[PDB]
Symmetry: C2
Subunit: 342 residues, 2 copies
Amino acid sequence: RDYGGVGTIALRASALLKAMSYYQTFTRNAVAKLPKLSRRIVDQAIKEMEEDGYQFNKKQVGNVEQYALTIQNVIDIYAHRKIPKYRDIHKSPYVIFVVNLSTVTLAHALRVHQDLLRHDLRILVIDLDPQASSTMFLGSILETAAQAMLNNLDAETLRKEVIRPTIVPGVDVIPASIDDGFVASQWRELVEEHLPGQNQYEILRRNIIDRVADDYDFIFIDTGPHLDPFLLNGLAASDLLLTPTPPAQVDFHSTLKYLTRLPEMLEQLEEEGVEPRLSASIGFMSKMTGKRDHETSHSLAREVYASNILDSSLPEALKKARTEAERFTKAVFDRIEFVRGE
Amino acid sequence: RDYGGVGTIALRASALLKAMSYYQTFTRNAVAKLPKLSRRIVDQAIKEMEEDGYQFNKKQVGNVEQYALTIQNVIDIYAHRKIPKYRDIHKSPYVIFVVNLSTVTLAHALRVHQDLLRHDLRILVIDLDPQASSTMFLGSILETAAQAMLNNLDAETLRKEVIRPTIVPGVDVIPASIDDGFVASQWRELVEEHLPGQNQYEILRRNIIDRVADDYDFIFIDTGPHLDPFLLNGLAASDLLLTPTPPAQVDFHSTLKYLTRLPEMLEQLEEEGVEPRLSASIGFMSKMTGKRDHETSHSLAREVYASNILDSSLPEALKKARTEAERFTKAVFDRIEFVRGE
């Protein structure tokens, strides 16, 4: 009956669908407390910089004029002080495959961090998760990552049309949709149509990542579990596996179950003729509390991840959480730099 | 590098994996307030019933003896009163495909409901969702639904080994795993191996559902989106589509996007030679609040679902929520009965 009655709901829906279609400033003294800077450097940087244009941001507090430099003002002072940016040390595109069994939150943190601003970090968060969890950070969108890969777009198109800005200017995001799930269920088939002779597991690196390579210092990748064409494409273009491990006694079991399954994944990429770039890995507990079991699955974490485990775990709601999260970011950031070398 | 360094984590994990492997009573007066009963019926039912065995539950409160009948005591009184059970009106297995873009909570509600106890409802919740969201309701398990389908098990095996009990005796659950996601990614392939000549989209109805048919009044099915072999098998064995619609202005868009995609799904089942049983549908808002937009996407709900929409939406934490949820259950239960007819 309603089998012929679901098409109705369908149509009603589709029809209805048609008709459907940030400010952190610092005080001088604050900027002075930042790395490689002091009240003498700042006061001199500002003086010199205004001596030939450039306008710093100022508050109207009290009655008088203030001085509330923005993340850009600070970055520009570091630039005037000729302090190399992250894009001056590393060749471009460090791709981080995030093992989510949030991501934009790390991107946002890394960006505005205290002792990281000197890096003028450029972060991209490509959302390949059907649920679009991340997508909820930046009207209605149109170009999902799954779609962009199939449309053989050009550098410019991804730039001024596909990539979307967020609440944090330095961090950009390529949105996902609930539609992409369907796209996956027919991935190979579509690749054979839209991307003749193309390797279904190298599209991500060729049609998006390599096309925006000279634009981002870091590029994160988000995907659900089960998914394969997306998961496979993700693993196939990333050089660092970032595995956040849950504290939950039960979630601890799952993540392990999941980990013990990567070899097979990485193998399929071998039979399809692709050669994973994966070359580093980071693991860590999430909000691990002062509870036996949760502190017990933590001790078991160091096991598997061995040396590859973090030395800090990502976490009363305010100064009690923020100070703890910041150190987590710094922790993740330093691992990359270390690993990036030897 | 760590591509050959992920296998290590893998092994450490796998290894570590190896070493890894309710009480509601009623007062007489309460039972009297129940449908088709009164203080005269109860007092007479109990007298008569004890006259020849049977022991009702009693509390030690005050100092004296009480009378706290259990869900079974009440059901047995309704049975003594020769009031037909749900399994006496309907032939067996009403399969409900739940559209989750919880389920056990409905099963639990329907079971212990006030005016539904007279039904002695037998509910099964087959978890085909890779995340095992539901699974978190009933040591470590072993037989997931995806696995049970592939093992061509027998009625008895599913009964005393695969089906797992929960905190509510009448409601049973067939667990899921994070492993099943992998199982899906290779579904057809495996069906060709383990189930020669079998139709990949009719396994659920043949290897589990039809094998436990004379044991459950209701059988719910849980699955994530993207998934196909599981989604397809679900739709292919269910006779009622239960679509709960989220209040969230954005989630409202998704559910519609999803709805407008069922025709295609139901079509694949046609090309594979299967004939969906889907014949009814129910839709409703979830916790819809007193907010414009959330009350606005509600008005738009009645549109699509048309007559098929509920007349009550599923929802200060206590008596303010419970009384509201109960009526929701009753609402869902009556729709089934209505629809079950004409």
